[PDB]
Amino acid sequence: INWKGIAAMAKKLL
């Protein structure tokens, strides 16, 4: 539920 902590976090960060 968050395209900024998933499409940018786990996707880029994690």
Cα separation values, 10 from 1, 2, 5, Å:
13, 11, 7
Residue 7, both tokens: 């499409």
Residue 12, both tokens: 């880029």
Cα torsion angle, 3, 8, 11, 14, sign: negative
Instruction: Match 């880029």 to its residue by tokens.
Output: 12
Burial call 1-14: b when 16+ CB within 10 Å, e when fewer: eeeeeeeeeeeeee
Dist CA 2 CA 12 (whole Å): 14
Strand extents, DSSP E, the chain: none
